[PDB]
Amino acid sequence: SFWGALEDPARYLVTFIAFAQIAAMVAQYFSPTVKGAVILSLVWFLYRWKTNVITRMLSADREKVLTLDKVSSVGLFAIGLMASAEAVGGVGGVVTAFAARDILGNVLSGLSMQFSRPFSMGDTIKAGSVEGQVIEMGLTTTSLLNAEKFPVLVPNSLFSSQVIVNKSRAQWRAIASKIPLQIDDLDMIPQISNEIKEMLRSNTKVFLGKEAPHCYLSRVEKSFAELTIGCNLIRMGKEELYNTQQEVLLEAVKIIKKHGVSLGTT
Amino acid sequence: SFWGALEDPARYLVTFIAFAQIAAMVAQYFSPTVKGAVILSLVWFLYRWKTNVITRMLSADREKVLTLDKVSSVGLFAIGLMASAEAVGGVGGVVTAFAARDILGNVLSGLSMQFSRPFSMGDTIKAGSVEGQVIEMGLTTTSLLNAEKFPVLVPNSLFSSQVIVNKSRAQWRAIASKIPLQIDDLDMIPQISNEIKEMLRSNTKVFLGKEAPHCYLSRVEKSFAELTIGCNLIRMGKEELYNTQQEVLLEAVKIIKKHGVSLGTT
Amino acid sequence: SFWGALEDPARYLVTFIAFAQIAAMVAQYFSPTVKGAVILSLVWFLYRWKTNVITRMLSADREKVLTLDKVSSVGLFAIGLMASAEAVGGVGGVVTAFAARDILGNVLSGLSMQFSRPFSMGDTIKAGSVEGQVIEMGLTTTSLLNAEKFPVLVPNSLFSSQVIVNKSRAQWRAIASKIPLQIDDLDMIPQISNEIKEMLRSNTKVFLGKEAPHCYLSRVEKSFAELTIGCNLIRMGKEELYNTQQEVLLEAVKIIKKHGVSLGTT
Amino acid sequence: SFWGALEDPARYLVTFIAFAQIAAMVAQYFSPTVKGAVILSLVWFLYRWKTNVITRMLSADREKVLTLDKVSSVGLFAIGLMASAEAVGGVGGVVTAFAARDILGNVLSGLSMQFSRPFSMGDTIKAGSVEGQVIEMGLTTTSLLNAEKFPVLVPNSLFSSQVIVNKSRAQWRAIASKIPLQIDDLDMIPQISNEIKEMLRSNTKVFLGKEAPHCYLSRVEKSFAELTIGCNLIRMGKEELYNTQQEVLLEAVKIIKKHGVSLGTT
Amino acid sequence: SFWGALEDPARYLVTFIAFAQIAAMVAQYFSPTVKGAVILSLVWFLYRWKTNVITRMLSADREKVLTLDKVSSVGLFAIGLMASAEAVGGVGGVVTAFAARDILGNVLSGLSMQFSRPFSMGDTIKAGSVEGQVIEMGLTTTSLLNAEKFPVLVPNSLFSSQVIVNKSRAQWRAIASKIPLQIDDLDMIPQISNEIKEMLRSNTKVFLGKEAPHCYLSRVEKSFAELTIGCNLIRMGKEELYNTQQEVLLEAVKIIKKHGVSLGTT
Amino acid sequence: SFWGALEDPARYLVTFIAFAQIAAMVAQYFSPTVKGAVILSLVWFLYRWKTNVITRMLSADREKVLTLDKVSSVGLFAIGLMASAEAVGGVGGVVTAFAARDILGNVLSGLSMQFSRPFSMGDTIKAGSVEGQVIEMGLTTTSLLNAEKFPVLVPNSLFSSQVIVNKSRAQWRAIASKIPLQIDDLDMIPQISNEIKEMLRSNTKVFLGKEAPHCYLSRVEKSFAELTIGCNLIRMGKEELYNTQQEVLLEAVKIIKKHGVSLGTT
Amino acid sequence: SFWGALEDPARYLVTFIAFAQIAAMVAQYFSPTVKGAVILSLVWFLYRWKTNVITRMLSADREKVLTLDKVSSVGLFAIGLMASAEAVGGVGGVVTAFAARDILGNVLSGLSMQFSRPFSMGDTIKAGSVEGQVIEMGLTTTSLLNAEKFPVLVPNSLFSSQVIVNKSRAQWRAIASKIPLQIDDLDMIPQISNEIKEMLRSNTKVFLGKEAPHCYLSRVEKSFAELTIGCNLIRMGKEELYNTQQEVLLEAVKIIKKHGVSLGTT
Ligand SMILES: CCCCCCCCCCCC
Ligand SMILES: CCCCCCCCCCCC
Ligand SMILES: CCCCCCCCCCCC
Ligand SMILES: CCCCCCCCCCCC
Ligand SMILES: CCCCCCCCCCCC
Ligand SMILES: CCCCCCCCCCCC
Ligand SMILES: CCCCCCCCCCCC
Secondary structure: OOHHHHHHHHHHHHHHHHHHHHHOOOOHHHHHHHHHHHHHHHHHHHHHHHHHHHHOOOOOHHHHHHHHHHHHHHHHHHHHHHHHOOOOOHHHHHHHHHHHHHHHHHHHHHHHHOOOOOOOOOOOEEEEEEEEEEEEEEOOOEEEEEOOOEEEEHEEEEEEHOEEOOOOOEEEEEEEEEEEEOOOOHHHHHHHHHHHHHHHHHOOOEEOOOOEEEEEEEEEEOOEEEEEEEEEEEEHHHHHHHHHHOOOOOOOOHHOOOOOEEEOOO | HHHHEEEEEEEHHHEEEEEEHOOOOOOOOHHHHHHHHHHHHHHHHHHHHHHHHHHOOOOOOHHHHHHHHHHHHHHHHHHHHHOOOOOOOOOOHHHHHHHHHHHHHHHHHHHHHHOOOOOOOOEEEEOOOEEEEEEEOOOOEEEEEOOOOOEHHHHHHHOOOOOOOOOOOOEEEEEEEEEEEEOOHHHHHHHHHHHHHHHHOOOOOOEEEEEEEOOEEEEOOEEEEEEEEEEEOOOOOHHHHHHHHHHHHHHHHHHHOOOOEEOOOE | OOOHHHHHHHHHHHHHHHHHHHHHHOOOOHHOOOOOOOOHHHHHHHHHHHHHHHHOOOOOOOHHHHHHHHHHHHHHHHHHHHHHOOOOOOHHHHHHHHHHHHHHHHHHHHHHHHHHOOOOOEEEEOOOOOEEEEEEEOOEEEEEEEEOEEEEEEEEEHOOOOOOOOOOOEEEEEEEEEEEEEEOHHHHHHHHHHHHHHHHHHHOOOOOHHHHHHHEEEEEEOEEEEEEEEEEEEEOHHHHHHHHHHHHHHHHHHHHHHOOOOOOOO | HHHHHHHHHHHHHHHHHHHHHHOOOOOOOOOHHHHHHHHHHHHHHHHHHHHHHHHHHOOOOOOOHHHHHHHHHHHHHHHHHHOOOOOOOOOOHHHHHHHHHHHHHHHHHHHHHHHHOOOOOOOOEEOEEEEEEEEEOOOOOEEEOOOOEEEEEEHHHOOOOOOOOEEOOOOOOEEEEEHHHHHHHOOHHHHHHHHHHHHHHOOOOOOOHHHHOOEEEEEEEEOOEEEEEEEEEEOOHHHHHHHHHHHHHHHHHHHHHOOOEEEEOO | OHHHHHHHHHHHHHHHHHHHHHOOOOOOOOHHHHHHHHHHHHHHHHHHHHHHHHHHHHOOOOOOHHHHHHHHHHHHHHHHHHOOOOOOOOOHHHEEEHHHHHHHHHHHHHHHHOOOOHHHHHEEEOOOOEEEEEEEEEEEEEEEEOOOOOOEEEEEHHHHOOOOOOOOOOEEEEEEEEEEOOOOOOOHHHHHHHHHHHHHOOOOOOOOOOOEEEEEEEEEEEEEEEEEEEEHHOOOHHHHHHHHHHOOOOOOOHHHHHHOOEOOOO | OOHHHHHHHHHHHHHHHHHHHHHHHOOOOOOHHHHHHHHHHHHHHHHHHHHHHHHOOOOOOOOOHHHHHHHHHHHHHHHHHHOOOOOOOOOOHHHHHHHHHHHHHHHHHHHHHOOOOOOOOOOOEEOOOOEEEEEEEEEEEEEEEOOOOOOEEHHHHHHOOOOOEEOOOOOOEEEEEEEEEEEEOOOHHHHHHHHHHHHHOOOOOOOOOOOEEEEEEEEEEEEEEEEEEEEEOOOOHHHHHHHHHHHHHHHHHHHHHOOOOOOOOO | OHHHHHHHHHHHHHHHHHHHHOOOOOOOOHHHHHHHHHHHHHHHHHHHHHHHHHHHHHHOOOHHHHHHHHHHHHHHHHHHHHHHOOOOOOOHHHHHHHHHHHHHHHHHHHHHHHHHHOOOOOOEEEEEEEEEEEEEEEOOEEEOOOOOOOEEEEEHHOOOOOEEEOOOOOEEEEEEEEEEEOOOOOOHHHHHHHHHHHHHOOOHHHHOOOOOOOOEEEEEOEEEEEEEEEEEEOOOOHHHHHHHHHHHHHHHHHHHHHOOEOOOOO
C-alpha cells in the first residue's frame, strides 16, 4: 500500500534524473528540470497515497466523498503544475472551444425551444432516435419517459435542426388492417367491400372530413383474397383507440361471414 | 429546502478560498479572485433559492411561469458574470457562428423554396426521411401531416439540396400486380395474356399514352405459374385508384378462370 | 388577438429595461440599449399584429398573399435591425459561403452536364438514389418521372461525381431465368440443355455477337434440379422485351416436357 | 404570357423602391440602389420573356436550342450583374476551388491510371460499387457495360485509391458446390469422397498447381449429409466454364449414385 | 541474433553514405549529415540489440519489464534524435492538440457528469452502444458490467452529449404480451377482454395512476385471433417482475379457457 | 465530321464576341479578351478535329495510340492556355495537395509495411474489405488473389492503420460443429459427451496445449437435443484440415449411434 | 526487355522536347528544362532496366532482395530529383503531418495503455471490431488471437478512446436459457418454477451474491409454454462453464418431466 506508493515514483524519478545527467553530457537547463521532476514525482506520490487512503476509508456522506476526492485529485494535479511553473502550451483555446460548444450549444437550443415551442410537458414526442413522453423540460437537458417507462436524458442540442413528431397534437388518427379471405367465387367481393365501407360511415368515432374510409382488394391467390381496410378515427384517448380498433375488426368480420365467406390463412 | 440551498455553496466557497490561501503560499491576484468567488457563490445560492421557490409555487398563467423563470435563471447567471467582470474568453465567435448557421440557414432555405417552388399547400411530398401532406409553409419550419396523421415539424434547411418527390403533381399513375396460377398445360398461357391486355386497353381510366399495358409470365414451377400485370391509370383521386385496382384484379381473375384455369398457391 | 399581441412584447420590454436598470447599478451604455429595446419590442409587436391580420384575411390571389407577407415579415425584421443600428457580427461571410456553395454548385453542375452530356430528354437514368425518365433538364434542377410516375425534383449538384446508369443507350439486353425440374434420372440433363441452347440460337431477336446463350445446371436435390438459362436479346422496346421473355420461357418448357420430364417445385 | 412577365417584376420593383424610400427616412446610397434595382428588374423581366418565347418556339436543331438559351440565360444574368456594377463578394475562390477539385481530380486520376495501368479495354472489372466491361477509357470518364448491358459512366476520380478487382487477368478459376445426400449409413462417406477427388484429378480442364481438389463432409442430419466439392479450373472462356461446372456436377452425382446412395432434400 | 543486428544497419548506413557521396557530386551539408547518419545507425543497432536481449530474458517482475523496456525504447529513440540535433519540424502542436483533446475531453466530461449527475454507483444504464450496471465511476473512465457480466471500460467523453437511459430510476414498469386464440365465434371476444381488464385492476402490484390496463384485439384470421394485453406494474425488483409477468399470463389464460375458448397457433 | 467540328466553335465564338461588344457598351479589356476567345475557339476546334481523326483511324500499336492522343489532348489544352496567357487562379496548391496526399501516402505506407512487416509473399491475409493471397508486393499497390482467384489491386495506404488478420501464421486451428440428436431419455447425454471428449484426446492431429476439447449440450426440445463439439487441431495444410473435420464428425456420429441414439432433425 | 526499356522513355523525351521547342515559339527557361527532361528520362530508363534485371534474377536471401531493390528504386528516384534540382513544392509539411500522426499516435496510445492498463498478456478482450486473446503487447502494435486462432495485428491507436470489454477479469458469469413446454394445464406452472429455483440455489457453482436465480414464463401458445431460466455462476474455467450449463439444463428437464409435463416444439 504505502510501500509501492512511495517506491515506484521515487525509482522512476531517480531513473529520470540519471537519464538527464547523461543527457547533459551531449540544452543546459539542468536545475529547473530536476526541480520540476522532483515536485512532479512528489505529486505523483501524493496522488497514489490519496487514492490509497480513500479506498481505505471506503473499506469501512458517500457521494460527497467521491466528488470531494475527485476535485481534490484535479486540484492536487493543478497545484503540482503551478509548482512546476515556479521553477501553457496552447491547450486552453482548444478546451474552451470544446466546452463553449457543448455548454452554450445546449443552452442555445434550450432557449430556442422555449421561444418556438415544438412540444409541452406531457406530450409524446419522437425526435430521431428518442421517443416517449416529456416529463421534465430543463435548461440543458430534457427528460423523456420511453416505451418501457425508463427515464431518458436527452441534451437540448439534439433538438436543434431535427424533425420532431408530436403525437399528442393530432386531431384525428389513421387506422388500417388487412383481412385474409378463403373465398373461391370473387363475385361477392365488391358487395362485401361496399358493405364494409357503409359500416365505416354509419359508425360514430370516425372522421369523414378528409379521407373516405376504404376497403379494397390488395392481392389474390388460390382460395385466398386479402382486403385492406382503413379509416380515420376522431381524436380520442389510448383506450378508446384500442376498443375502436377491435370493434371495427369484429364488425368487418361479421359482415364478411354474413355473406357466407370464411376467413383465409396466411 | 432553504437549509441546503444556503449550506452547500457557502461551504464550497469557504473550501475554495481556503484552497486559494495555500495557493498564495507558493499569481498574486488574491483579492479579485476572492471577490469573484464570493459573488459567484452568491449567485449559485440565489439560483438554488429561485428554483426552490418556483417548485414551491408549482406545488400549488403556467407557460409564462416557465419561460419567465428560465429567462430569469439565464439573466441571473449573466448578471453574476457581469458582477465578476467588475472586480470574454472567445466563446462569442463560436456561438454566433452556430446561431448564424442554424437561423440563417433556415431562413435562406425558406426563401429559396419560395422562389423556385418545389410544392404548395396541400401537396403530398416525400423529402428523404419525411413524408406526408403539407399543412403549413412557414418562415423557418414547414409542417407536414404524416401517414398516421401526426403533425411533423421539419426545418426548412432539410429541403436545401435533397430530392423532393411530389406525389400530387402526377398526371398518370402506374399500377402492377402478380397473379399466381395453378395450371399444368401452359399452352393456354399466351392467349390468356393477350386477353388480359385487351381487357386493359378497352377499359377506360387507363392511359395508353406512353406505355402499353403488359401481362407476362415471370416464373414457373410445378402446377404453378405467375403473371405480372401492369398498366398506367389516368389522373384520379385516391378512392377511384383503389376501386380501379380492385376492378382490374377482378376482371383479370374472371378472364383467367374463364379459360378453365384455377388460381395457384404461394 | 390584438390584446396579447400588444401585451406580451410590452411586458417583456418593461421587464427587460427593469433588469437593465439594476444592471446599471453594478457598461454605461444605457440610452442606446433602451432605445434599441424599445424599437425591437415595437417590431415584435408589429410582427405579431401582421401575422394576426393575415390570418384574419385567410379566414375569409392566394400564393401572392403568402409570398408577400413572408417577404414583408423579413423586410420588417430587416428595417427593425436597421433602426437598431441607428441608435454586423460576422454572419455575412457564413451565409454568403453557404448560398454561394448551394447556388453556384447547382449552376456549375448544370453547365458541366451540358458540356459532357451523360443523358438527354426522355432517357431512363439511375443516379444513386434516384431513378426514372428525364422529363425536364433545367438550369438548377432536373426533373425525373420515377417508377410510380411521380415527378421527382433533383438538384444538378447530385450528378457531379456520381455514377449514372443510362438504361436508354443500351444496344442489347441480357435476360436470364431459372427453371426447376422434377427429374430422377439426370442422364437426360445434357441433351435438354443442348436443345435449349439450339432454341436460343435459331431464334431471332437474340444477339449472338458477344456471349453465347447458356443453359446449365446450377443445383441438384432429391427429385429436383435447376436450370439457369440466359441470353442477350437485340435492342427492342419494352413490350417486345416482355413478349420475348415469355416466348423464350414457354419454348424452354416445351423442350423440357418434350423429353418426358415434368417441372419441379421449390 | 407577356402580361405577367411584365407585371410581376415591375410591381416587385416599385414595392422595393417604395420600401427603400422609407428606408431612407431613418445609409445614404439612394440613387445607385434604385438604378441597380431598375436594371435588375429589367433583367428579370427579360429572363421571363426569354423563357416564354423559347417555350413558345418549343410548341411548334433541338439540342442546340437548349444549350443556346441556357448559355443565353446565364449570359443575360451576367450582363445584368455587370450593369449593376456600373452604377465580387468572395464567391470566386470558392467556385474555382470546387471546379478545380472536380475537373483536375478527374484529369489527374485519368493520367495516373494511364501510367500504372489497373485495366485495359475489354476487361471486366469491379471497383467498389461499379462492375462490368470496360468499353471506353476516356480523359475524364470511363465507360463500363454492367451486368444488364447498360452503359455506365464513371468519373476517373472514383478509381483513385480504391480496390480494383480485374476479372479478366485471372489464370485459373475456383469453383465449388454443395451436394445433399440421403444416406443413413455414413461408412460409405470416405470412399465416395476419395472417388470424387479422383474424378477431379484425372479430369482435364482442372488446375492442380496450387490447391488439391477437395470433397469433404460439412454437416450431418437425419437421413441427410452434405458434401462440399471444389477445385481450380484452368483459364477458359465463359462457356467452357459453365459446361465444366455442369460436367463436374453430373460426374459427382454419377459417382454418388453408383454407390447406391440417393440424393437428399433441403 | 547479434549478427544481423549489427549487420543490417551498418550495411544500410554505408549504402546511405555511398549514395550521399554521389549526391554531393551534383546542398553542401556533407559532414553533419554523415554524423547524423552515423549516430542514427548506431541507435538503430542499439534498438535491435535491446529487443534481442529482452526477448532473450523473456526466454528464461514481469509487467515492470515490459513497461521498462518500452519507455527505454522511446527514450533511446529520443536520445538518438537529440544527438542528431547536436550535429522540431512542427509535429509538436499536432500531438499536443491530439493529447489535449483526448485527455482534457475525458476529464471535462468526468467533471460535468459529477456536477449534473445522470447516474450513480449501481444504476443500470444504457448510453448509446454500451449498457449495463455502473460498478466504478472514475476520473477518466467509467466501468460498467454488461449483460454477460463482463467489465466494460467506457471513456467519460462518450457521455458528453448522448442520451442516457437510466433503468434504475423508474417508478413503474410497462409490461405487455400477445395471446393467440383459436376461436371461431368472435361474439365472446368483448366479454373476455372486459374480464381480463378486471383481472388487471383488482390485482395488486399494478399501477393505475396513469394508464388503464388494456386488452384489445389486434388481428384476426381463420380460426385465429390475437389479444394484446398490457399494464403498468409498480416499482419492484427483478424477481417480482418475472413472477408478476408469469402470474398475469396464467390468469389471462385461465380467463380465456374459462369461456370455453382454446388457444391458437402461429 | 469536319463540318460540325468547324461549325459549332466558330458560331459559339462569334456569339461570344457579339455578346462582348454590347458588354463593352455599358471593364475596358476588349482586345485581349477577343484574342483569347479566338485562340480558345481555335483550340476547341483542334480538339474536336483531333478526336475525329483518331476515331477515324480506330475505324481501320493500339494502347500507344490511346495514351498518345490522351497526352496530346491534355498538351493541346495546355498550349491553348499558355497562348491565352500571352495576350494561375490558385488551383495549383489544391492539385499538388491532392497528388501529394495520394502518391506520397501510398509510398509512405509501402515503406512502413516494408519495415514492420505485417505479411509476406504467399500469405493469406484479410485487411478490412479485402481478403486473399498476396501475389505481388509492390511500391504503390499490393496485389491479392481473392476467394474466386481474381487478381485484386489494393493501394498500400489501405494498410496504414487497419487491422490485418494473417491466416498463414497460425500455429493451431480451432474447429467446431453442432450435432442434432433425436433422443428422448437424456440420461445417456453425459456419458456420450465424455466418450466424445475421449475421442478428441486420444486422436492425433489435435492440440491439447491451451484448450481442452469440449462437447456440451447447448439446447433441448421435444425428441431433440444439440451437442456442440470443438477442439484445436495442430498446424496443417488445407487438405488435412478438411479430412480431419470429416474424420472427427464421423467418429462423433459413430460414438453417438453406438449408444443406440439416432440423429435428430432441424 | 532492354529494347522497350530504352525505347519508350527516349521517344517520350524527344516528343517532350519537340513540344517544348514550339512552346518556346510563343517562359524562356529552355536549357534547364531540357537538362531536367534529359536526366529524368535517364532515371526512368534506369528504373525500367532495374526492375527488368531484378525480375530476371527472380527467374533463377529472398526478402533482402525485395527490400533492397525497393529502397534502391526510391533512392534512384530521389537522386534523379536531386539531379533535377542541380539544373520543394510544399509536400513536406503534409507528409510529415501524416507520418507524425500515424507513428506518434501509435506510440502515444502504446504508452497510455502502459500507464492505465486496460488488459494484460493472456486476457481475452473485445475492442470494437476486434476480439480475442492478447498474445503480444508491442510498442506500436498489439497482437491478438481471434476466435479461429488466427493472429490479428491491431495498431495501438485503435485503443485510444474506445470501450474495451475484458472477459478475463469477470468474477461471476451470467447464464440463461429457454425451455419450451407442451403443457395444456398451466396450473402446474408455478410449482415447477419454484422447484427449478430451488434447484438453482441448493446447487454449488452458482453465485447468490447479487441476483437471485430466476425461472419465469415468458410466452404462451396452444399446447405450448416457454420458461426463461437464468442464474449467476461463480468464477470458473471454460470447461466447467460448459459442464455447468449442461448440468443445469439436464436438472431443469428432470424437474419438468418429473411433474408429468413433456417438452414442447418450436
Ligand atoms: C467545466 C466543465 C465543462 C466542460 C465540458 C465540456 C466537455 C468538452 C469535452 C468534450 C469534447 C472534447
Ligand atoms: C438565440 C438563440 C438562437 C441560437 C440557437 C442556435 C443554436 C446553436 C447551437 C447548436 C449547435 C452548436
Ligand atoms: C438567396 C437565397 C439563397 C441562399 C440559399 C442558400 C442556403 C444556404 C443555407 C443552407 C446551409 C446552411
Ligand atoms: C465550368 C464548369 C465546371 C465546374 C464544375 C464544378 C462543380 C462544382 C460544384 C460542385 C460542388 C460544390
Ligand atoms: C501526376 C498524377 C498524379 C496525381 C494524382 C492525384 C490525384 C488527385 C486527385 C484526386 C482527388 C482530388
Ligand atoms: C517513414 C514512414 C512513415 C510514414 C508513414 C505514414 C503514412 C502516412 C500516409 C498515410 C496517410 C496519408
Ligand atoms: C502521454 C501520453 C498521452 C497521450 C496520448 C494521446 C494520444 C493521442 C494520439 C491519438 C490520436 C492521434
